[PDB]
């Protein structure tokens, strides 16, 4: 069984369609995979629970996340990690906040 994967895959596609107004980069870009431990080894010593979109999708396929509540918390952690690690107003920080506002609206509709 695919569990909640079909619904979360739809959410992820909607997130990927949120593009920056100036350069059109998808706001999901920097969140698709974890930072490279080779490039940013210290990220893994300051961020207690790393999270990325690939992990959320794999967790939905393998049954680790069976509820939208679990996905909500995984996204919350992902965005909190980005707001902690990156400078306020940087492209990564703004992408986190804009995506978080979008996902909050989506969860509201799926909890209505």
């Amino acid at each position: 069984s695919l569990g909640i994967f079909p619904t979360v895959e739809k959410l992820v596609e909607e997130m990927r369609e949120q593009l920056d107004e100036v350069d059109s980069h998808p706001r999901t870009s920097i969140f698709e995979k974890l930072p490279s431990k080779r490039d940013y080894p210290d990220y893994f010593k300051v961020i207690e629970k790393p999270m990325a979109i690939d992990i959320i999708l794999k967790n939905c396929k393998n049954g680790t996340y069976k509820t939208l509540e679990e996905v909500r918390q995984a996204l919350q952690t992902m965005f909190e990690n980005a707001r902690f690690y990156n400078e306020e107003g940087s492209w990564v920080y703004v992408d986190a906040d804009k995506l978080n506002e979008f996902t909050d609206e989506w969860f509201k509709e799926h909890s209505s």
């Binding site: 920056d20 100036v22 350069d23 980069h25 870009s29 920097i30 930072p35 940013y40 210290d42 990220y43 300051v46 690690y85 990156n86 400078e87 107003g89 940087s90 492209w91 990564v92 920080y93 703004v94």
Partner: peptide, 17 residues
Amino acid sequence: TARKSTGGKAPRKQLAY
């Protein structure tokens, strides 16, 4: 805001140590 040209992260300076 536009992506950093190399695509890098934007760590707070203290976290670059």
